[PDB]
Design a protein around this nucleic acid. Structure first.
Ligand SMILES: [Mg+2]
Ligand SMILES: [Mg+2]
Ligand SMILES: [Mg+2]
Ligand SMILES: [Mg+2]
Ligand SMILES: [Mg+2]
Ligand SMILES: [Mg+2]
Ligand SMILES: [Mg+2]
Ligand SMILES: [Mg+2]
Ligand SMILES: [Mg+2]
Ligand SMILES: [Mg+2]
Ligand SMILES: [Mg+2]
Ligand SMILES: [Mg+2]
Ligand SMILES: [Mg+2]
Ligand SMILES: [Zn+2]
Lengths: 100, 136, 39, 103, 77, 135
RNA sequence: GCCGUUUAGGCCACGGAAGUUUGAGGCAAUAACAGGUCUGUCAUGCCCUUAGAUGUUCUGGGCCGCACGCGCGCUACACUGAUGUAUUCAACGAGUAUAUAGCCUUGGCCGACAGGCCCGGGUAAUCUUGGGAAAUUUCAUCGUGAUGGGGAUAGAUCAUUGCAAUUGUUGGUCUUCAACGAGGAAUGCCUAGUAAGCGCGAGUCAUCAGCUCGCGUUGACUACGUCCCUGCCCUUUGUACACACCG
């Protein structure tokens, strides 16, 4: 039921959907289900290591172990119910905090 | 001659001046700007060319009635500062102390998330994309 | 995705009036095109 | 048998344009035609300002380049064949002749 | 001084400017603008630009109004 | 007529006309809208709609075929961008359209073929009548 | 007319649109610099690499990171003002088949705004656009208060561009209301429609202008000199300098 979710989502998020998410996010979404099936009964599922950082987290995603690439490392991420509405970008820092 | 003329008003824990005009006295509350104070002064039907302090209290009770129920006096959806809440989902008008309360609940959310903006808040760095070679 | 017609460079491109030349090739060919230095 | 023929001329050079423009008007004056012209339209100056240096060093100095384009119009009442007889004389380089029929 | 914060003391509407003060204030030159007396008589404006109206309704002193909120005075003639 | 009266006192006189001359509808957002994206507060005077009407029927009475995207430029102005330089901004099209629609629903102006808005013969009549009565 | 070999010229004056070469630009010598540019050029010598590439293309990241020092600037510190009405005067420019309405967009309708739908014009002194600009003028509100000056920082939320907006593209709505009380030593530009104030266009451009290049609008203070400081030209002079006094 994506349609009532886009109403919950903020304006950037629903505009993103209204443009028709292309092939790569559709190839990524399947692998979360696939990992959940592979995962032993009530166990930590396989890491899903992704290149995409502009995909938005949809309520299906909660439970996946994604490895959002930050340019150099495949930094693994875990999803919580509050992680809804952001991208996988803001969870893999691309830089390092500065200490002079 | 305002014989009961008040100089302090303590409306909503904000210590309103009794020495100023209403639409700029009620802006002292954290959550009401000049625009919202104007809308309050209109819907409660108050002479705006009145110093806050020359007021009658029955007027004041209506002021609080409109500010605590902004949705009820037909104040439109876009006017409020809590459009489409994320904790609940309501269109509210957060007021003096709940502004800080809610704000720190948001930044706490982003902190527990490991959000980019949460970490920018925690580090004390700028959070909105501005440059920082030479600013700060 | 927009280059100089004369050299295929990507910087200092003049797209005004439909020229699509870079600021240096346009100077080298300005007189031939018909652009006169009056003032 | 008489139409409303508008002949429009464009050029970069004033004099080469005005020679042809006078020649057409006089060639249509011998035929006792109604020549309502020449009408002069505001000169269009195409301007491009460019940095002289290729490398961005020194004083920043600019050169302003300009193409002046002039727009003349001649009006006639005739049949298109008489005018084509007239607009067939030797035309100087750079002049555009774009005869049409107005409404 | 605080002559818009002073607009609603008991004094300001009991007798204060209603000939208890501005009998004299124009008359030091027989004629001194109320907009001039905003500082010589330290009392400023708009507790005082709304009383120059009241003297008008009361028929005491004539005026001119112009751009910068310039206002004027003449005691009795 | 209208060009023999100062356009400030005339607009005061006309905006007092539409008030006590019958009525028109008034939206249920007149007390809350700012009349321009760049404005800070709504119009200070509660009787501003009528002013905005009386000032606005004089525009069509001295011109012909003015759309709404031209009235927005008429009543637009300077917008200050805080720390960036200020520029020119246009006002809101909703009030501009609504006042014209109301003038239609009184018969002072009418929409024009070839586009735009034109003063009516009767709308010309009352404007010169009121002009005759301004000091 | 006066000064001057009563030459070349100079100052004053009627006239006159104009009497600094009328104003403003373009162009611009010999000789030089180890000035900058191999990252504009399928301009180029030599060197290096040439497949496990320093080639090309794809994906993602950075070029924007932030204790700090510097340079050009934008906004201001308010009443010779801010806000809200009314009122209304320019110029220079711009508009690729821009897909099947598309670049500039009028007009009509929906919307508080943002923005949207429909009917259309223009390859343009023809349509946008007489470019209905701002400062300014006007009548009110503020009242010497970090105030209604200022608008940084930040929360929520809407929409737009784009294949994608996250370290927010940008534009809206409400809210948040920082420093800043005219700035030490130093230092820059400026002689008339000039400085300064005000806005507009173009370049960049799918989107983004606090920049640059132009344009009009409002329109002064001071001087009409001097060689004191910084330099420049010519002559005379001194020199143990010639990479030349940074000797
Ligand atoms: Mg300014
Ligand atoms: Mg000269
Ligand atoms: Mg080179
Ligand atoms: Mg790349
Ligand atoms: Mg510079
Ligand atoms: Mg302000
Ligand atoms: Mg104003
Ligand atoms: Mg950019
Ligand atoms: Mg631009
Ligand atoms: Mg630049
Ligand atoms: Mg010696
Ligand atoms: Mg030697
Ligand atoms: Mg020495
Ligand atoms: Zn080139």
């Amino acid at each position: 039921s994506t349609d009532d979710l886009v109403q919950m989502f903020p304006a950037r998020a629903r505009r993103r959907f209204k443009r028709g998410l292309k092939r790569k996010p559709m190839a990524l979404v399947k692998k979360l289900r696939k990992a959940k099936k592979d995962a032993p009964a009530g166990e930590k599922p396989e890491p899903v290591r992704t290149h995409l950082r502009n995909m938005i987290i949809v309520p299906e995603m909660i439970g996946s172990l994604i490895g959002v690439y930050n340019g150099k490392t495949f930094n693994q991420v875990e999803i919580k119910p509050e992680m809804i509405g952001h991208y996988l970008a803001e969870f893999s820092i691309s830089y390092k905090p500065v200490k002079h | 001659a305002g014989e009961e003329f008040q100089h302090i008003l303590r409306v909503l824990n904000t210590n309103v001046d009794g020495k100023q005009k209403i639409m700029f006295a009620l802006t002292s509350i954290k959550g009401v700007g000049r625009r919202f104070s104007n809308i309050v002064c209109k819907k409660a039907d108050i002479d705006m060319n009145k110093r806050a302090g020359e007021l009658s209290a029955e007027e004041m009770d209506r002021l609080m009635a409109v500010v605590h129920n902004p949705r009820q006096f037909k104040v439109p959806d876009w006017f409020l500062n809590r459009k489409k809440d994320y904790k609940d989902g309501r269109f509210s008008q957060v007021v003096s102390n709940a502004v800080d309360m809610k704000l720190r609940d948001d930044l706490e959310r982003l902190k527990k998330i490991r959000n980019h903006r949460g970490l920018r808040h925690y580090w004390g760095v700028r959070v909105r994309g501005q440059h920082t070679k030479t600013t700060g | 995705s927009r280059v100089c017609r004369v050299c295929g460079n990507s910087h200092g491109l003049i797209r005004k009036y439909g020229l699509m030349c870079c600021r240096q090739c346009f100077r080298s060919n300005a007189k031939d095109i018909g652009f006169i230095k009056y003032r | 048998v008489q139409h409303r023929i508008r002949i429009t001329l464009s050029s970069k050079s004033v004099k080469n344009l005005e020679k042809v423009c006078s020649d057409l008007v006089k060639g249509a004056k011998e035929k006792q035609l109604k020549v309502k012209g020449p009408v002069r339209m505001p000169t269009k100056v195409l301007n491009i300002t460019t940095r002289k240096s290729p490398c961005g060093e020194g004083t920043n100095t600019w050169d302003r380049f300009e193409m002046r384009v002039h727009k003349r119009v001649i009006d006639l009442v005739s049949s298109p064949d008489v005018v084509k007889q007239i607009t067939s004389i030797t035309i100087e380089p750079g002049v555009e002749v774009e005869v049409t029929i107005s409404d | 001084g605080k002559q818009k914060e002073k607009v609603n003391n008991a004094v300001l509407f009991d007798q204060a400017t209603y000939d208890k003060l501005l009998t004299e204030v124009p008359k030091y030159k027989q004629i001194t603008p109320s907009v001039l007396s905003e500082r010589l008589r330290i009392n400023g404006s708009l507790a005082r630009r709304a009383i120059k109206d009241l003297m008008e309704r009361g028929l005491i002193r004539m005026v001119s109004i112009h751009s910068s909120q310039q206002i004027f005075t003449r005691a009795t003639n | 007529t209208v060009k023999d009266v100062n356009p400030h006192e005339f607009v005061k006189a006309y905006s007092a006309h539409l008030k006590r001359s019958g009525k028109m509808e008034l939206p249920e957002w007149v007390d809350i809208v700012k009349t321009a994206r760049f404005k800070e507060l709504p119009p200070s005077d509660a009787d501003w709609y009528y002013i905005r009407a009386a000032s606005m029927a004089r525009k069509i009475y001295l011109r012909q075929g003015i759309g709404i995207g031209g009235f927005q430029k008429i009543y637009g102005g300077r917008q200050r961008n805080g720390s960036r330089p200020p520029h020119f901004c246009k006002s809101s099209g909703a009030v501009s359209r609504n006042i014209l629609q109301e003038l239609q629903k009184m018969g002072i102006i009418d929409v024009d073929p070839k586009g735009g808005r034109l003063i009516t013969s009767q709308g010309r009549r009352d404007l010169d009548q009121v002009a005759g009565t301004v000091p």
